[PDB]
Design an enzyme around this catalytic site. Structure first.
Site, short mmCIF file in Angstrom:
data_model
loop_
_atom_site.label_atom_id
_atom_site.label_comp_id
_atom_site.label_asym_id
_atom_site.label_seq_id
_atom_site.Cartn_x
_atom_site.Cartn_y
_atom_site.Cartn_z
N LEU A 25 -3.68 8.94 14.66
CA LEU A 25 -3.95 7.45 15.15
C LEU A 25 -2.79 7.46 16.52
CD1 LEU A 25 -1.57 7.16 11.35
CD2 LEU A 25 -3.93 6.73 11.39
N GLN A 72 3.46 1.15 3.67
CA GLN A 72 2.59 0.33 4.27
C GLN A 72 3.88 -1.23 3.63
OE1 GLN A 72 -1.29 -0.88 5.72
NE2 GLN A 72 -0.08 -2.99 6.03
N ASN A 114 -2.13 -2.75 12.25
CA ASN A 114 -2.85 -3.21 13.34
C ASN A 114 -4.37 -3.38 12.54
OD1 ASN A 114 -3.01 -0.86 14.12
ND2 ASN A 114 -2.90 -1.41 16.23
N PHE A 126 3.63 0.00 8.56
CA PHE A 126 2.88 1.38 8.50
C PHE A 126 4.55 2.46 8.59
CE2 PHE A 126 1.61 5.72 10.23
CZ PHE A 126 0.57 5.73 9.26
N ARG A 163 0.36 -1.27 0.26
CA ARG A 163 0.24 0.39 0.20
C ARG A 163 1.07 1.32 0.13
NH1 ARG A 163 -3.75 0.43 4.73
NH2 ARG A 163 -5.02 1.86 3.75
#
Ligand SMILES: [Zn+2]
Ligand SMILES: [Zn+2]
Lengths: 74, 190, 310, 54, 276, 43, 248, 147, 157
Positions: I113, I54, I93, I104, I46
């Protein structure tokens, strides 16, 4: 009995409606019937020569049926 | 400053980041390569990079095509394959019988559908009504609304083809429109 | 991603019915398949070879709501909403006979496979017909006062488990024509009732989207319920979904109205599979009887899916 | 942070381009925001006008 | 009250136009073999007019929800009365219609007729009718105001005296459509054949400014209905309390973050902001 | 194999995007309910 | 193969009976033939069935509902949406230009080649909330009714461009009965012809040449009904300052 | 507008008769530029490019119309498009390096030259890039170009 | 207490500074996975521009990831570490206390976050490599069309 009476009633209704022999396509089917000759007579008398402005939405089909006029003659 | 005695340290510039990396222990927003102010709806193509991080102009070459169009746009496409450093052993074999039969089936299906279309166009089927006029059902989960974001009820659609009068000619006169422009012309690899 | 069966493909699609497929059953040897569908027909397939529709049985005046095989696979029995059962010789593909006497839609039927062969039928006139497959007249009929939608025969051959509108699985003794006892706990109408291949437990699936396994061995506590598997919602069609056990009995499958056949582990209770593939409600889910990992799913898609469990 | 000012054993200013984008805007992600000077645009336009006149 | 009949079917019988040609064409239902000048000048007087007090009433369209007004009631030539299937009423301000249709149920178009007559266009939200062929006197403004106030609710009457032309801008497009159909070929205090069309876009830059401002007012009304009032306050920023909520919520902890507008106003169930 | 209970139980990691309909107004899927079902619910 | 129709154009019944006709109509936008989907409404109105009026290509290119031709993101007419947030897209409407444009877009979209306006309406609301000798006061001769009962017309002074006749007529209607009301924003003038002499007299006695209508000060007196001609720019300017100087 | 419609009609009548004639396209686009219809002239140039995708004279006309009317970003987009389309036409590469040196972006000139050298041009282009670095005093950079 | 971890990727070399004082179990999980070679030839499945890169998934899909403490372990939300800027390493997660193997890594300040992701390092070198990894083109599901893989990950100390 007195607690499942309705559930029995609509179960029987729904099962009979879905799986009856009379509705084997979703609907009750019947044979195509004959109309009165006066119905066809009234239709042709009303349209006449196709001159009144009411019958424009018929004019396209009327002239379109010219393609099939040879069958009618035979 | 090294880890973990960066308390009191407070960077000012990518000089202070060094080779970059924000410090999570400092409770200020950091920008190791500079702040982004905005992007005030420019019409420019987004600058992208290739597999090994260089600026790529094949976006210009590929602009207006699909993703799977083969477009030769680089000097590498002009070097004989057996001399391209990235390859050592080229497999020059025609596809096997199973792949040929899978291809023949897929193309026979698509072409057969077009043959039926051409046949029904070449011979209109006398009366253009169908007896087999069954219904399609469509499950229809909707999206929100024009102006409402409240969720609303899932929808079952019963679609039937309309009974049209068999005596009717076609409804609309055809028109002459100039043919549209070609697909974006490829680089001339001379 | 290995190869675990002698099929042409890990999943094949059988199409050709022109209506919802309400039932589909395997041969006792697990090489032939009979599917009964609302186009009032039964289609006969060979699973191995490549696959071949080798038979069509016609004669029923309404939807084929259930079917079963004989003990050895030469006679096929079928119950249909024309208020009739029928027995068909499959060597000639011809109807041996019709079993008449039910007054409403025959929702379910089962065939007693061991000892001496019988036919059991559950129908909306509140009746459980006991039929000998030699006479068109019923040997017996249990007369309830509620419609019956699922029936099963004990391995002993003289108890009938029946569930219907009343949400209670009533276990009856045939020779007394009388109810032994009622397993309780379902909230909507029972759609399938099936005994495990070893014979000590009973799968029941009802229209409250819960597939419950019950105990069948005579020594059991007052609450005979073993487990309540979840994961297969009833959709918007009130169909009679028919699950099954694996041949080894460790797996337990039903169909689900979102087009999905759901398989759990009967011993543990965990959702082993949630296999997709159908666009209508999945009316029938059958494990292969020869111990193969082959699963068959028949839906109201006018088609069925026959896959392997790799 | 793309240039390192270093001093060798001779104590002189040596600049080191960490990337290679000091001298050329090829490989520079910001190559599309050099807005040229108005005098430069005028000089190019007058060049083209002179060509047209000739 | 029930809807009264305006005229009688004895004179609402259907028959040909008067003969202006050698032969009657039955496809197009028109006379042929004649001339073209006759058609151009011939624009006769209207055969009727309708009354809110006397004629407007109730019908099967008042029974049936979501139906249209009667065009022949608007023209005053509806002999149907209570048995008409379309409303016998002037639209109120709560009577709105989609762009694809007009108040009489007739389809609207992507364009205009080249004489600006007919149904109208969904490519321009026109509320302004153009009334020409007016007898030029001094009381013309009073007469226009009286008659069109009888025909609906007005945002702007602009009557020119040089050419005798009244531009009337209603506040409801349905009112404008009803007024055009109810005032075409009718007469004011003098016996005249009014040429009531759709007005063209006003070349006056004040009118251009006010029309554009009304476009953004309507659009911003739609936006503020679409968005929550708290995103509205934060984005508008006309008041310091919503401004300081904007800084704090866009900070999300860290000092000097000033979150992107896309991240802060990205609506969804679980995206970033608890305002979603 | 993709439809095993473990594979369906494991969810996609990572934080959500802070920034798939086939119809412009929603998602439409071909469906195979019964005609009696549709007629009864419509009624 | 399924229309892009919004939920308000769709029936209230969640179970929809649609008719589908290939080449059923001309698109209102591009004038090409397209498959029509039509459904019977909710109330058995005479009318017709509600149908798709534009093709799916024009609906995707204008982000419109296929029946109502309104914008799928806010519920606006397409012209209003694109005029106010004009940075989305233009469109061609000359004859073969519009068929040519539609055929090229449809061929491109179908063979593969070819959420966006949050910033546009945030900017629109920012812009819309960015906001845009001395004459004597009236005297006893100005608020006293003249003995000439034939003079019925009241005269209103100093009218801004954004003062509408509907609220003016509602105000004078809750006072009295109006025969006519002429308002010219071009010359900032108004005449009011009432119906009842008593009502006109009592309303003008209530207001005394002074009126507060929607934050606009207006001077009302008596005057003979006069045709508003093409007044001088100085005439309408002094007219405006008279309306402003009605309130000291 | 009457005169403009008449001229537009005669221009497009000649394009329909002979679309393969560059002068038909050229005179139409030059007339729209003279009318200050830059969108219209651009559209004419692009329709001409649909008929003549690989025409060096046409690409130069379009690029020069943008540069003459000071549409520098339009012109640089055209220059990238043209040297993508025709990477072995050294005229377009020379025009692009010349334009960037006129604009005073010597890093931009080096960028265009680096892309050209990736295409491996002839000796005249290698010489021109050596002479660029010698003009601006980077003899080590010219040494690298000789390597 | 900082440990270097070198990720040689297809777009350059990332040097990662791991914070052993703040998130020790997660940091040593990263060390052991890199040292075993669990990240060799593993792609960045990603990339979302101005948000995130990620990676660490060996299946390349976003549901895999097998840690060294069994399957998952707990979240270490040390309240002094925030997602303050670009190039900040955290553990991806599915939910709370579900840290596995996928990492990440912020490309931008993402301070929403905090309280749900465990910062356990940063980049000490290679921030332009990370920037261009953010500038690669992707698809609708944010997967890079142009393929990015960690060729080899190892440890330096
Ligand atoms: Zn269209
Ligand atoms: Zn709509």
């Amino acid at each position: 009995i007195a607690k499942f009476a309705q559930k029995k009633k609509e179960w029987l209704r729904m099962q009979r409606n879905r799986f009856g022999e009379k509705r084997k396509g979703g609907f009750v089917e019947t044979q195509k019937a004959d109309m009165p000759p006066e119905h066809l007579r009234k239709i042709v008398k009303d349209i006449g020569d196709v001159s009144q402005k009411k019958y424009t939405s018929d004019k396209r089909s009327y002239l379109g049926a010219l393609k099939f006029m040879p069958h009618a003659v035979l | 400053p090294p880890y973990p005695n960066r308390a009191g340290w407070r960077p000012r510039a990518p000089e202070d980041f060094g080779d970059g990396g924000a410090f999570p222990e400092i409770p200020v927003a950091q920008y190791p390569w500079g702040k982004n102010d905005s992007s005030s709806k420019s019409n420019a193509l987004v600058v992208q990079v290739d597999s090994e991080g260089k600026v790529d102009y094949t976006a210009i070459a590929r602009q207006g095509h699909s993703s799977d169009r083969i477009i030769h746009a680089s000097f590498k496409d002009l070097i004989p394959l057996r001399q391209r450093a990235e390859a050592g052993q080229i497999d020059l074999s025609r596809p096997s019988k199973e792949e040929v039969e899978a291809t023949a089936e897929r193309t026979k299906n698509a072409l057969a559908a077009l043959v039926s279309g051409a046949l029904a166009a070449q011979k209109p089927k006398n009366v253009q009504v169908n007896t087999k006029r069954e219904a399609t059902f469509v499950k229809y989960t909707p999206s929100a609304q024009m102006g409402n974001n409240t969720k609303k009820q899932e929808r079952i659609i019963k679609i039937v083809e309309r009974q049209r009068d068999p005596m009717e000619p076609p409804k609309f006169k055809h028109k002459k429109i100039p043919r549209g422009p070609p697909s974006p012309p490829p680089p001339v690899m001379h | 991603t290995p190869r675990t069966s002698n099929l042409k493909a890990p999943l094949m699609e059988l199409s050709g019915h022109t209506g919802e497929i309400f039932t589909a059953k395997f041969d006792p040897t697990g090489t032939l398949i009979a599917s009964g569908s609302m186009d009032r027909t039964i289609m006969l397939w060979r699973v191995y070879g490549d696959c071949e529709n080798y038979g069509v049985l016609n004669g029923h005046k309404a939807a084929i709501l259930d079917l079963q095989w004989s003990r050895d696979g030469d006679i096929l029995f079928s119950a249909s909403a024309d208020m009739h059962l029928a027995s068909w010789d499959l060597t000639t593909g011809q109807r041996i006979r019709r079993y008449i006497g039910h007054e409403e839609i025959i929702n379910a039927m089962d065939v007693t496979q061991r000892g001496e062969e019988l036919l059991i039928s559950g129908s909306d006139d509140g009746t459980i017909g006991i039929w000998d497959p030699r006479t068109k007249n019923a040997v017996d009929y249990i007369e309830t006062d509620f419609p019956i939608t699922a029936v099963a025969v004990s391995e002993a051959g003289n108890e009938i488990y029946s569930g219907g509108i009343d949400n209670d699985i009533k276990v009856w003794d045939i020779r007394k024509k009388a109810v032994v006892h009622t397993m309780l706990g379902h909230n909507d109408t029972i759609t399938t009732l099936r005994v495990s291949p070893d014979g000590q437990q009973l799968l029941s699936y009802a229209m409250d989207s819960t597939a419950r396994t019950w105990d069948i061995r005579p020594f059991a506590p007052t609450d005979r319920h073993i487990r309540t598997f979840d994961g297969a919602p009833l959709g918007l069609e009130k169909n009679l979904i028919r699950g099954s056990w694996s041949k080894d009995g460790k797996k337990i499958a039903v169909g689900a109205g979102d087009g999905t056949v759901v398989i759990w582990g009967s011993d543990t209770g965990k959702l082993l599979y949630k296999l997709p593939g159908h666009k209508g409600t999945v009316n029938c889910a059958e494990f292969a009887p020869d111990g193969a990992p082959i699963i068959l799913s028949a839906s109201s898609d006018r088609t069925m899916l026959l896959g392997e469990l790799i | 942070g793309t240039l390192d000012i270093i001093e060798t054993e001779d104590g002189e200013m040596i600049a080191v381009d960490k990337d290679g984008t000091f001298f050329s805007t090829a490989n520079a992600t910001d190559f599309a925001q050099h807005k040229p000077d108005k005098a430069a645009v005028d000089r190019l336009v007058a060049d083209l006008r002179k060509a047209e006149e000739a | 009250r029930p809807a009264r009949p305006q005229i009688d079917p004895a004179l609402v019988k259907s028959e040909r136009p008067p003969q202006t040609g050698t032969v009657f064409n039955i496809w197009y239902n028109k006379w042929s073999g004649g001339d073209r000048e006759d058609k151009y000048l011939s624009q006769t007087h209207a055969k009727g007019r309708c009354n809110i007090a006397r004629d407007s009433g109730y019908t099967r369209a008042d029974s049936r929800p979501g139906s249209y007004f009667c065009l022949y009631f608007a023209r005053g030539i509806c002999p149907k009365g209570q048995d008409c299937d379309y409303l016998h009423r002037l639209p109120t301000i709560h009577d709105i219609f989609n762009p694809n249709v007009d108040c009489f149920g007739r389809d609207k178009f992507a364009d205009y007729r080249d004489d600006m007559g007919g149904v109208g266009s969904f490519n321009r939200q026109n509320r302004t009718i153009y009334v020409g062929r007016i007898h030029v006197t001094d009381d013309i403004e009073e007469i226009v105001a009286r008659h069109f106030a009888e025909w609906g609710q007005i945002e702007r009457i602009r009557v020119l005296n040089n050419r005798g032309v009244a531009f009337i801008t209603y506040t409801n497009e349905a009112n404008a459509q009803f007024a055009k159909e109810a005032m075409a070929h009718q007469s004011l205090d003098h016996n005249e054949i009014l040429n009531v069309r759709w007005a063209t876009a006003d070349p006056n830059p004040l009118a251009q400014k006010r029309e554009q401002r009304r476009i953004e007012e309507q659009a911003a009304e739609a936006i503020r209905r679409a968005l929550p009032a708290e995103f509205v306050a934060e984005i508008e920023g006309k008041d310091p309390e919503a401004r300081k909520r904007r800084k704090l919520e866009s900070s999300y902890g860290l000092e000097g973050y000033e979150a992107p507008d896309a991240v802060h106003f990205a609506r969804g169930p679980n995206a970033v902001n608890p305002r979603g | 194999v993709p439809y095993t209970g473990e594979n369906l139980a494991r969810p996609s990691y990572g934080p959500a995007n802070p920034f798939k309909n086939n119809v412009l107004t929603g998602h439409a899927e071909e469906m195979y309910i019964s005609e009696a079902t549709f007629r009864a619910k419509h009624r | 193969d399924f229309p892009s129709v919004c939920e308000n154009c769709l029936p209230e019944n969640p179970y929809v009976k649609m008719l589908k006709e290939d080449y059923g109509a001309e698109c209102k936008l591009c004038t090409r033939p397209f498959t029509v989907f039509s459904w019977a409404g909710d109330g058995r109105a005479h009318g017709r069935k509600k149908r798709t009026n534009i093709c799916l290509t024009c609906a995707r290119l204008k982000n419109a509902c296929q029946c109502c031709i309104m914008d799928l993101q806010f519920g606006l007419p397409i012209v209003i949406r694109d005029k106010a947030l004009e940075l989305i897209a233009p469109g061609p409407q000359s004859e073969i230009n519009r068929e040519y444009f539609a055929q090229n877009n449809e061929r491109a979209i179908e063979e593969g080649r070819a959420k966006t306006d949050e910033k546009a309406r945030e900017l629109l609301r920012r812009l819309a909330n960015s906001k845009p000798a001395a004459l004597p006061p009236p005297g006893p001769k100005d608020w006293l009714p003249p003995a000439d009962k034939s003079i019925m017309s009241l005269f209103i002074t100093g009218i801004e461009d954004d003062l509408p006749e509907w609220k003016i007529r509602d105000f004078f209607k809750q006072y009295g009965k109006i025969k006519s009301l002429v308002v010219s924003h071009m010359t900032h003038c108004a005449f009011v012809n009432y119906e009842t002499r008593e009502g006109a007299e009592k309303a003008a006695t209530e207001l005394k040449g002074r009126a507060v209508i929607a934050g606009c000060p207006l001077r009302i007196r008596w005057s003979i009904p006069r045709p508003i001609g093409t007044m001088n720019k100085e005439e309408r300017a002094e007219m405006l300052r008279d309306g402003r100087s009605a309130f000291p | 507008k009457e005169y403009q419609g008449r001229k537009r009609r005669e221009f497009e009548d000649y394009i329909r008769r002979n679309r393969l004639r560059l002068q038909n396209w050229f005179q139409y686009a030059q007339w729209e530029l003279e009318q200050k219809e830059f969108a219209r002239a651009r559209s004419i140039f692009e329709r001409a490019l649909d008929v003549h995708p690989n025409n060096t004279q046409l690409w130069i006309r379009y690029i020069e119309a943008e540069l003459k009317n000071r549409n520098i970003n339009h012109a640089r987009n055209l220059l990238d498009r043209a040297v993508t389309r025709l990477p072995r036409v050294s005229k377009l590469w020379y025009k692009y390096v010349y334009v960037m040196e006129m604009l005073g972006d010597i890093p931009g000139t080096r960028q265009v030259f680096d892309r050209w050298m990736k295409w491996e041009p002839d000796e005249d282009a290698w010489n021109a890039y050596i002479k660029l670095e010698k003009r601006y005093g980077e003899y080590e950079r010219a040494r690298q170009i000789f390597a | 207490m900082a440990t270097d971890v070198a990720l040689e990727t297809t777009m350059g070399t990332i040097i990662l500074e791991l914070y052993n004082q703040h998130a020790p179990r997660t940091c040593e999980n990263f060390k052991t996975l890199a040292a075993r070679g669990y990240y060799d030839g593993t792609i960045f499945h990603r990339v979302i521009k101005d948000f995130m890169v990620q990676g660490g998934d060996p299946t390349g899909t976003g549901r895999g990831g097998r840690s060294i403490y069994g399957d998952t372990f707990e979240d270490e939300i040390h309240p002094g570490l925030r997602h303050t800027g670009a190039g900040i390493l955290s553990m991806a997660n599915a939910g709370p206390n579900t840290n596995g193997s996928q990492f990440f890594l912020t490309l931008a300040p993402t301070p929403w976050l905090d309280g749900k992701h465990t910062i356990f390092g940063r980049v000490k070198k290679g921030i332009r490599v990370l920037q261009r990894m953010g500038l690669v083109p992707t698809d609708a599901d944010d997967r890079p069309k142009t393929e990015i893989k960690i060729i080899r990950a190892y440890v330096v100390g």
